[PDB]
Design an enzyme around this catalytic site. Structure first.
Site, short mmCIF file in Angstrom:
data_model
loop_
_atom_site.label_atom_id
_atom_site.label_comp_id
_atom_site.label_asym_id
_atom_site.label_seq_id
_atom_site.Cartn_x
_atom_site.Cartn_y
_atom_site.Cartn_z
CG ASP A 293 24.15 29.99 -6.90
OD1 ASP A 293 23.74 30.49 -5.82
OD2 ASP A 293 23.59 30.23 -7.98
CG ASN B 25 -0.33 -0.04 2.54
OD1 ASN B 25 0.89 -0.06 2.64
ND2 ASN B 25 -1.14 -0.05 3.59
CG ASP C 176 20.84 34.80 -9.35
OD1 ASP C 176 20.44 35.09 -10.50
OD2 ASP C 176 20.78 33.64 -8.89
CG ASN D 292 0.83 2.99 4.36
OD1 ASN D 292 0.38 3.28 3.24
ND2 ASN D 292 0.20 3.28 5.47
CE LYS E 269 18.66 38.00 -11.01
NZ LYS E 269 17.67 36.99 -11.48
NE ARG F 183 17.58 38.97 -20.56
CZ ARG F 183 16.46 38.81 -21.27
NH1 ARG F 183 15.97 39.79 -22.03
NH2 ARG F 183 15.81 37.65 -21.22
CG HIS G 122 17.91 29.08 -0.83
ND1 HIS G 122 18.63 29.10 -2.00
CD2 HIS G 122 16.99 30.07 -0.93
CE1 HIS G 122 18.15 30.03 -2.80
NE2 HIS G 122 17.15 30.63 -2.17
N1 LIG Z 1 11.48 24.16 -2.18
C1 LIG Z 1 11.51 24.71 -3.40
N2 LIG Z 1 12.09 24.09 -4.46
C2 LIG Z 1 12.11 24.66 -5.68
N3 LIG Z 1 11.57 25.86 -5.94
C3 LIG Z 1 10.95 26.59 -4.98
C4 LIG Z 1 10.89 26.04 -3.62
N4 LIG Z 1 10.24 26.93 -2.86
C5 LIG Z 1 9.91 27.97 -3.65
N5 LIG Z 1 10.33 27.77 -4.93
C6 LIG Z 1 10.18 28.67 -6.10
O1 LIG Z 1 11.34 29.50 -6.17
C7 LIG Z 1 10.99 30.87 -6.32
C8 LIG Z 1 11.46 31.65 -5.09
O2 LIG Z 1 12.86 31.92 -5.20
P1 LIG Z 1 13.38 33.33 -5.77
O3 LIG Z 1 12.81 34.43 -4.92
O4 LIG Z 1 13.11 33.32 -7.26
O5 LIG Z 1 14.99 33.27 -5.57
P2 LIG Z 1 15.77 33.45 -4.17
O6 LIG Z 1 15.25 32.30 -3.33
O7 LIG Z 1 17.22 33.31 -4.55
O8 LIG Z 1 15.40 34.82 -3.64
C9 LIG Z 1 9.47 30.94 -6.49
O9 LIG Z 1 9.16 31.21 -7.87
C10 LIG Z 1 8.95 29.59 -6.06
O10 LIG Z 1 7.93 29.11 -6.94
N1 LIG Z 2 0.52 0.96 7.79
C1 LIG Z 2 0.74 -0.32 7.47
N2 LIG Z 2 0.45 -0.80 6.23
C2 LIG Z 2 0.66 -2.10 5.92
N3 LIG Z 2 1.17 -2.99 6.80
C3 LIG Z 2 1.50 -2.64 8.07
C4 LIG Z 2 1.30 -1.24 8.48
N4 LIG Z 2 1.69 -1.14 9.76
C5 LIG Z 2 2.12 -2.37 10.15
N5 LIG Z 2 2.01 -3.27 9.13
C6 LIG Z 2 2.38 -4.71 9.14
O1 LIG Z 2 1.25 -5.49 9.49
C7 LIG Z 2 1.40 -6.04 10.80
C8 LIG Z 2 0.16 -5.68 11.62
O2 LIG Z 2 -0.91 -6.58 11.32
P1 LIG Z 2 -1.48 -7.69 12.36
O3 LIG Z 2 -0.46 -7.98 13.44
O4 LIG Z 2 -2.02 -8.83 11.54
O5 LIG Z 2 -2.71 -6.94 13.06
P2 LIG Z 2 -4.14 -6.74 12.34
O6 LIG Z 2 -4.79 -8.11 12.38
O7 LIG Z 2 -4.80 -5.73 13.25
O8 LIG Z 2 -3.83 -6.24 10.95
C9 LIG Z 2 2.71 -5.50 11.37
O9 LIG Z 2 3.45 -6.48 12.10
C10 LIG Z 2 3.48 -5.02 10.16
O10 LIG Z 2 4.38 -6.02 9.65
#
Ligand SMILES: Nc1ncnc2c1ncn2[C@@H]1O[C@H](COP(=O)(O)OP(=O)(O)O)[C@@H](O)[C@H]1O
Ligand SMILES: Nc1ncnc2c1ncn2[C@@H]1O[C@H](COP(=O)(O)OP(=O)(O)O)[C@@H](O)[C@H]1O
Ligand SMILES: Nc1ncnc2c1ncn2[C@@H]1O[C@H](COP(=O)(O)OP(=O)(O)O)[C@@H](O)[C@H]1O
Ligand SMILES: Nc1ncnc2c1ncn2[C@@H]1O[C@H](COP(=O)(O)OP(=O)(O)O)[C@@H](O)[C@H]1O
Ligand SMILES: Nc1ncnc2c1ncn2[C@@H]1O[C@H](COP(=O)(O)OP(=O)(O)O)[C@@H](O)[C@H]1O
Ligand SMILES: Nc1ncnc2c1ncn2[C@@H]1O[C@H](COP(=O)(O)OP(=O)(O)O)[C@@H](O)[C@H]1O
Lengths: 307, 307, 307, 307, 307, 307
Positions: free
Chosen positions: A217, A35, A168, A37, A191, A193, A128
């Site tokens: 950078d 799933n 920049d 998870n 910058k 431009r 950053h």
């Molecule tokens: N975690 C991130 N990863 C990539 N891009 C991002 C993230 N957070 C914001 N941005 C983008 O980057 C820009 C903000 O940075 P900017 O102001 O252009 O440059 P600086 O951070 O050097 O001042 C926005 O256009 C925004 O959409």
């Molecule tokens: N979020 C999750 N998604 C899928 N499997 C999980 C998750 N959390 C735990 N498990 C697995 O499933 C087991 C729990 O199931 P189980 O002991 O049969 O109890 P139940 O009968 O309540 O499902 C755990 O030992 C682990 O290996």
């Protein structure tokens, strides 16, 4: 009792970090159920341990975030004495502004998520923006890559007739600090431009024509900023361009845009797992992270690494 | 003041919830940058609104979890008066015990994460165990699937002298409520392990030979638990086997295992988006969620739709 | 730095825990004023100590709960380095679901109360359900009773071709572990309601006729659940019936119902103080708690005493 | 939507409070299981309600504390909009000092317990010390009984040739405030007691001999302070003594010591359920609490009741 | 690693504390920019240190409060293992009640500000009221000035015909204790404050006759209470009046009023920087604070100082 | 019920805000005792009110900070429904990074102090950096001064041959936006701060040639950046220089340096109380703050002001 663990993001770095101190990577497993998870488990006892969990925010980012949060949570549930989130690259440090209404300041959100997961501190490199430090209430040790980047330029390039460049305006601080350290002039390329005047292509500031250009950078993601700064540098006169950054994220069309660019060499740290490239070079920060971890464990001065 | 929003996990369910109380879906966009980092934005004002954000924990779950966390955080940052996490399917409800040492009790972690993100309440349907309620400090309204599952068996099976079965002791609670609202007698199974070996040597209880079987379960993930019971039922007698659950997760070998098994029809709600199969009926719970949401907004008894 | 203290609920158990690791009981007095208000005081310094406070939830439980809360608060106010709530029996573990509308999930409330009082961890034995662990943010070490219950059956019953039974599906988990460590086959019951009508029309599973029964349960309160199973077992065959549980609560009609029932012997730990009866054996768990506490103080694997 | 509920401590007061506003007591039940564990349930919907829960800290105190905490918790879990702990008598306000090392400042502990149970505010009367208000972060409305006590003395006693008396030094503030309100002199009777001089029996301050003495205190618990102040007053000359207090706790040998004392009449409020006594009189504060609740609900000035 | 630092309020006291521990005074800088904003900086590492920060609330009080909060915050941000706010004089302990509606209980506010800045403990001396302790969740070590004041009186005064005098009811506990310590009789004033500078004596209680009167109080601020108490004692027949207080704040008209008064000598500790006057004497509490700090660091008994 | 109050920092602004809403300025008293301790008191009820408290961080800054914290605290203690800290100038927004080791990120500290005092929201204008928003968990409405500065320039200056100038990189975003707003070209300075009073221009970027230069910055404190920027523009051939900033702090040598400089006119808002100078102009932000407050109270869109 110093213990180091890794998520899935950058196990080679985490291995190298532990190895630097003559320690193994601690045993932890993370599975993905059918799933989609996550499940996380420590094989050995963490009890009363000073535990450091290494994870970078590289693709798949949200699985890595959650793995980190779960590993932090599980470590505190397994009675660790202290838990440090070692985040060599914190990509969401770019989400540090409310630059449009009704968004998440995601860096701050993740800081709070980390804290509620149970992290007692953070160890990171080249955020950053420096203001991201203030998003955490828990202590953050924020490492610089200037020593390794400066060493790279001083040893690889030839600094007779050289200039460090800022494309920049936001780059000016870090480029200025490198220029003083290398004994080089600083230059700027427009910058805006210039959206009005006669010369529509980028306007120049400082002496570039004969010289070899050095770009610093924080990170390179799509290389879009890099490639456009290099083309501007060449048409402005420059002989050659070398680039460096802390975080080689190298995502989307980065590798191909670098290959097509006349940039000679692009150096990045191993905060992010490096990718294959003839012109790509990686500067390791595993010994630096290792020495920081050791000093955090022992209560020795971390800031004296950079002073 | 009533606004409704969806992530990317089940926009159809949220569209139906919205249409069922005569309101449009609120405009919200969620992007991915090249570096795989999420970005969330509300296009319209949510100020002083009573906002409901719909997200199920479907693959890819970590992106959906993070988007939910970000949308809740952005809604509080946009000055929503109240924000409810409408989580039709909460998959990590299954991570509710510390059955292995040094793991994350991930359902608890996520409750805490939701709270620090800024959720004021949760609206959810059929949690894996009733103890998950106690992982939340905030109020959780816990909708029951028994009405819509009973009204499927009644409306299009119609078997006198039938029997109703549980795959799990734990879902015995669910099969001692359906069962006997319909008026049939009982049966159940109980063993491990879904995450181990083949499928699956079991232990059954009750009188089945001259009787026709109905299955009631919380969820169907890999459909191993479904096929195990259908094989065990339809071998020591038993005319025909029908199947019902709340959460139609349907991953891994499930869709194929349904076609291969002699089970007649499998019934699931639309908490998770519907997956197309031959004998696969899906029961809309959008009117039920819309009614719960209308009651939450107006302060009317939500408990009254159980009795 | 290892100090141990008791409330008024089970000073014998705590005295035995203390003697079993070669340390005296710490001096603490708890008074009642004429107005029925509690007052707690530590006679010796606890400063920078690793303090363990023993209290079971036995009648009168609210006074014992409050005294525990006060002792934890007073220990943090006296500058203990760490405080563990040693709760051998956590009775409110049974209040773990919201099975009726508008009630308190009291196990969760109490976890939160313990935390705000200042408890850094919990040490407990055999919680009613495994989900209660997730009600605590703080670490809980969860001791198992299986070793001492098995070593009673082995050491003074000695029945080849025996069978082992559960009163509850839920304690099926406990009876699918004893069972098969001993090497016998299985049986169980599952119905409601202890807080309603007489005792109690039931449903049993397994082969019992030419076999002799052992009962495994988490706790015995009114002993209705015990007498129900003994009547159901020793009527459809079954030579003789023995009984075992972790928590010997023994209240209401229990002591009398044991004498009246054909059950041979009832086994309980000393988590709750021992009550005198004819066929009533009690197994000391003070050495097990003392070993867990020694390990917690020294940072050694507590998980290792399960395997 | 204004809703009032009661615990078991003082249902007559809570009934009278609700009645004062033409409202019924809301329907809630609290049971005690055979193991002495509490259980709490609201019969009707509290959803979006402004809910007020009335409980005084009278014997059995710890059951009443827990019932209050559980009722507060359940009310927030049942989606009340606001929850007010109405505590007419807060007995642990006497536990407000660290007057011996290594005790609990229990008043502060209970304030934090209340807050984590989910209380948004407190409504109380005549706290033992005014500094107890500062133990709560949540708003506290602190009602005075001076108006009803002053009315009692002005209407019942005969204030020609009268003086209000302070036996303790800690009583001086409240006795002075009553003296100004009644237009009477103030007197003091020695608090030491002169452990050296010629006159060993209590030394007098101010004119008492001919006069009728009036004693005001916050509470009467064992009546030990009362009885010793009256005997001192009589041997110092006084004709007669009348006593009043807010909280008639009347516990241990209080009733008999009052009966044996030559005090003429002792008045107390109904914050605590009153006991049978020929010389005991009760001044009701149900209309005062009711008018406070109404004003808290409506955002009207509570302090103007006393100004 | 034991580390002591100072704000600007009382560097000589901090220096004397450091020198009595055999340690240097840690290097801290506090700057004020032209915009009146503060800036703090620790010159060397305090990482994993047991940090003690000395600051009294003397004028300018708000600058000193903010500097303390910033220094605590910076210590935590620089990875101190533990930080203790050493507050020799906590002036806001007088803001301990809501004695007018709609004010701040400022002592409590500050306790919470200190906690959120990151203080783990408080070390203080002679709090105005004993309830202020309960405003702090973090541990507070509360030192008595009684031993040094008693050592001083035994030194300077004839104790044959002496009596100790509390200038108000709030100080009766402290004066009583000095009486019992020195084997002397006791007397007190019922004080009525009319303004910050003006007070009135309502009544004098106890045998003065022709004695050497020893006034002891918590603090001397404007000296209005001191000089009114002196006058009251003299024309009640006392031979002479000596005065001592813990906190020599001496603001407004205090120095002038002490000169005019027939009080022979006024001794205060150096919790506050002393001021020059012929009748003024100061007793150093540096050894006592040093010893308390030494014990807090080593986990030895602090109460043992005063018993 | 909309209620506005003022600290001592900028009563004229608060008064103008109140009058623009058609409301009186709420009655608050702030006193300073002789010991320099503050005291706040609301004269009338603010119960269930929507409370706005106006305070700028101007000298004396720490008094104003503490008064704000106390007023917020007292508002919550007096049962305000909601309290908003209206901070027209947040000076500590400059303390937004750890640019030396072992300092306070004071902006973040204050954000947390404000939150624990009980502020539910912040309303502010022109924060020094856009990351400061992320220091607050509570919602902050961040108003732009750009509309009024643009309205002012359109009024006072010839815009035919104009260019807007950012005096540093941190201000480039704000200046750019004004350029795009007014349809003008853009230029900027790379600034290097050497002290609080002294700065240096590293390079000027953009076409100045012979233009009317419009400087816009966040604040003017010592005016060192303003006057260096003016000089740089002039001997780069500019015709004339007009300056505007949001925050006219004007401390140290600012007024004198503005007089000496050939800058024609310096306009700032009244976030800070203005100071008299021939070249000084002030634009009122009372209508904008009033409109924002009106909208916050009514749940109308605040972003709509700036789009
Ligand atoms: N975690 C991130 N990863 C990539 N891009 C991002 C993230 N957070 C914001 N941005 C983008 O980057 C820009 C903000 O940075 P900017 O102001 O252009 O440059 P600086 O951070 O050097 O001042 C926005 O256009 C925004 O959409
Ligand atoms: N979020 C999750 N998604 C899928 N499997 C999980 C998750 N959390 C735990 N498990 C697995 O499933 C087991 C729990 O199931 P189980 O002991 O049969 O109890 P139940 O009968 O309540 O499902 C755990 O030992 C682990 O290996
Ligand atoms: N702490 C408690 N002590 C005793 N009885 C309880 C407690 N909490 C809940 N109960 C009662 O017991 C019931 C829970 O038991 P039940 O539903 O049979 O589950 P289980 O089989 O896990 O005991 C509740 O409905 C309630 O009436
Ligand atoms: N909640 C309580 N109920 C009854 N007595 C208490 C309580 N808390 C403390 N005490 C007792 O009361 C005394 C403290 O009050 P005391 O200082 O004598 O009077 P006052 O409170 O008027 O100053 C102590 O001897 C203590 O044992
Ligand atoms: N921090 C403070 N510094 C100086 N004066 C204060 C402070 N806080 C409150 N006050 C003033 O002092 C008064 C309280 O004084 P009082 O009750 O005589 O003290 P006590 O009775 O404890 O000796 C308050 O009503 C107020 O006017
Ligand atoms: N609150 C404050 N008020 C005045 N000056 C400050 C404040 N906080 C920090 N500083 C000083 O200002 C410097 C930062 O200035 P600078 O980096 O030039 O601002 P920016 O680059 O954002 O324009 C700090 O290194 C410190 O010396």
């Amino acid at each position: 009792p110093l213990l180091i663990f890794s998520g899935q993001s950058n196990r080679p770095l985490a291995q190298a970090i532990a190895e630097a101190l003559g320690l193994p990577l601690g045993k932890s497993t993370t599975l993905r159920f059918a799933n989609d998870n996550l499940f996380v488990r420590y094989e050995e006892s963490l009890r009363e341990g000073d535990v450091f969990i290494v994870q970078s925010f590289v693709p798949p980012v949200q699985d890595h975030l959650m793995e980190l949060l779960m590993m932090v949570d599980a470590a505190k549930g397994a009675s660790a004495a202290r838990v440090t989130a070692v985040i060599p690259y914190f990509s969401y440090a770019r989400s540090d502004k409310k630059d449009a209404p009704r968004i998440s300041i995601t860096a701050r959100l993740i800081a709070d998520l980390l804290q509620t997961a149970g992290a007692d501190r953070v160890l990171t490199m080249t955020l950053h923006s420096p203001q991201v430090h203030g998003f955490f209430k828990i202590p953050v040790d924020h490492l610089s890559a200037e020593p390794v980047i400066a060493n790279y330029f001083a040893t690889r390039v030839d600094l007779e007739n050289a200039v460090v460049v800022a494309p920049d305006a936001g780059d000016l601080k870090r480029a200025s600090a490198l220029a003083r350290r290398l004994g080089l002039p600083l230059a700027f390329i427009d910058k805006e431009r210039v959206s009005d005047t006669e010369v529509r292509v980028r306007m120049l500031v400082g002496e570039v024509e004969g010289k070899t250009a050095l770009i610093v950078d924080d990170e390179i993601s799509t290389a879009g900023s890099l490639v456009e700064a290099v083309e501007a540098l060449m048409q402005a006169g420059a002989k050659e361009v070398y680039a460096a950054a802390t975080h080689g994220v190298y995502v989307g069309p980065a590798l191909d845009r670098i290959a097509k660019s006349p940039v000679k060499e692009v150096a990045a740290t191993d905060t992010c797992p490096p990718k294959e490239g003839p012109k790509l070079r990686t500067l390791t920060v595993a010994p630096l992270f290792a020495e920081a971890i050791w000093r955090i464990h022992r209560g020795e001065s971390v800031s004296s690494l950079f002073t």
